[PDB]
Design a protein around this ligand. Structure first.
Ligand SMILES: O=C(O)CNC(=O)C(=O)O
Ligand SMILES: [Cl-]
Ligand code: NI
Ligand SMILES: [Zn+2]
Length: 338
C-alpha cells in the first residue's frame, strides 16, 4: 500500500530488472499503481541500443503541428499535418532559435515557461510512428514483445488486439504536448526515453480519475455534450494551477534519458517534452486490468476509435464471472488500491 498515492521511482539491480512482468508485479505490490504512474530507472549497464547514430536517417512520414487555443490554464489542442521529414531534419528544426528550449533555472521554471508560452509558436511533434529502435536480441523490457496477457490472447486464442501492443516512436521538441488521457480501453502503457531532453508528466491517481472528468465536463460542456468520453480525443489541456485551485489531487515527475515510465489502468496523465528527444511506447495488460477493460467509457462520437472485445479475457481469466458478466449481472465498483 502506497497511501499518499505519490509517484514512485524504482532503481532495480540487474537481477531484479531482467524480468519485466515479474518486476511490474513487484511494483504493484508496493502500491506503485495508486499514483497512476511510476518511474523505473534500469541499471546503468543496460543498453537497449548500442548506437543511436543511424536513427538520424529515419523518416517521420507525418509530423504534427500542435495548435493550442484557450486561456488561463484551459486549452484545446488540434493537429495540422506537415511534410514528411527525416529525424536529422527534425532535430535541426527543434534546435533552431524558433523551436529550441528557452533558458531556464530549473524544471519548475521551465514548467512555468511552458504554460506561459503555449499559445505562441506552434511546436511540431513527430508522433505515433510505427516501429522500435531496440537492437535485435535485447530480451529485457523489449517494448515490441512484453509477453503480457494481451500477447497471450492474440497468439494462443487468435483474437485481434488492435495493434495496441505494437511499438510506437515519438520525436519531441520543446513544448510538444500530450493532453490529459487514459490509455485506450484503460490499458497500461510503458514509455522509454531513448535519448534527448526530458519529458515531464502529470498524473492523477486512478481513485481520483472521476474528479478530473467532472472538472473537465464543467470546463468543456461543449466537448462533453457531443461525447461521453471526450478526453479520449486527446485534445484537452488543464494546467496544474487549475487542478490545485479545484482540489484535484495530482503529482508530477520528469523522465530523463534512459528512463522508463509506466502508466496504470485509469491513470490520467499529461505533459510535455523539454526539447529534442525520442521515446518509444506501447500498451500492455495484466489480469488486474480486465475489470477496468470491462467498465471503460468509450468514445461515442467517432468511427475508428480503439475497442477491444473483453469476452476472451473474462472467459479465460475470470471464468467464475463470465456467465454473470454476459447476463449483465456482474456489477461492481473498482478498488484502485488492491
Ligand atoms: O510522450 C508522449 O507523447 C505521451 N506518452 C504517453 O501518453 C504514454 O507513453 O503513455
Ligand atoms: Cl518558450
Ligand atoms: Ni498515455
Ligand atoms: Zn468521441
Amino acid at each position: 500500500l502506497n497511501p499518499s498515492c505519490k509517484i514512485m521511482t524504482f532503481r532495480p539491480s540487474m537481477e531484479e530488472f531482467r524480468e519485466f512482468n515479474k518486476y511490474l508485479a513487484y511494483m504493484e505490490s508496493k502500491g506503485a499503481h495508486r499514483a497512476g504512474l511510476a518511474k523505473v530507472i534500469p541499471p546503468k549497464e543496460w543498453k537497449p541500443r548500442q548506437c543511436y547514430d543511424d536513427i538520424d536517417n529515419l523518416l517521420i512520414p507525418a509530423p504534427i503541428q500542435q495548435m493550442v487555443t484557450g486561456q488561463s490554464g484551459l486549452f484545446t489542442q488540434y493537429n495540422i499535418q506537415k511534410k514528411a521529414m527525416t529525424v536529422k531534419e527534425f532535430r535541426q528544426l527543434a534546435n533552431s532559435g524558433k523551436y529550441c528550449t528557452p533558458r531556464y533555472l530549473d524544471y519548475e521554471d521551465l514548467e512555468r515557461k511552458y504554460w506561459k508560452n503555449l499559445t505562441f509558436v506552434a511546436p511540431i511533434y513527430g508522433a505515433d510512428i510505427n516501429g522500435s529502435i531496440y537492437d535485435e536480441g535485447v530480451d529485457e523490457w523489449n517494448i515490441a514483445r512484453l509477453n503480457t496477457v494481451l500477447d497471450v490472447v492474440e497468439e494462443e486464442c487468435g483474437i485481434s488486439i488492435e495493434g495496441v501492443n505494437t511499438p510506437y516512436l515519438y520525436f519531441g521538441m520543446w513544448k510538444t504536448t500530450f493532453a490529459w488521457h487514459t490509455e485506450d480501453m484503460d490499458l497500461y502503457s510503458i514509455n522509454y526515453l531513448h535519448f534527448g531532453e526530458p519529458k515531464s508528466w502529470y498524473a492523477i491517481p486512478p481513485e481520483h480519475g472521476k474528479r478530473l472528468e467532472r472538472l473537465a465536463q464543467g470546463f468543456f460542456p461543449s466537448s462533453s455534450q457531443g461525447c461521453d468520453a471526450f478526453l479520449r480525443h486527446k485534445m484537452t489541456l488543464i494546467s496544474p494551477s487549475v487542478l490545485k485551485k479545484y482540489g484535484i489531487p495530482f503529482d508530477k515527475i520528469t523522465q530523463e534519458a534512459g528512463e522508463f515510465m509506466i502508466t496504470f489502468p485509469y491513470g490520467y496523465h499529461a505533459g510535455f517534452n523539454h526539447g529534442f528527444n525520442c521515446a518509444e511506447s506501447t500498451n500492455f495488460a495484466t489480469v488486474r486490468w480486465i475489470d477496468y477493460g470491462k467498465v471503460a467509457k468509450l468514445c461515442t462520437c467517432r468511427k475508428d476509435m480503439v475497442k477491444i472485445s473483453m469476452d476472451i479475457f473474462v472467459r479465460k481469466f475470470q471464468p467464475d464471472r463470465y456467465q454473470l458478466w454476459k447476463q449483465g449481472k456482474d456489477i461492481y465498483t473498482i478498488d484502485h488500491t488492491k
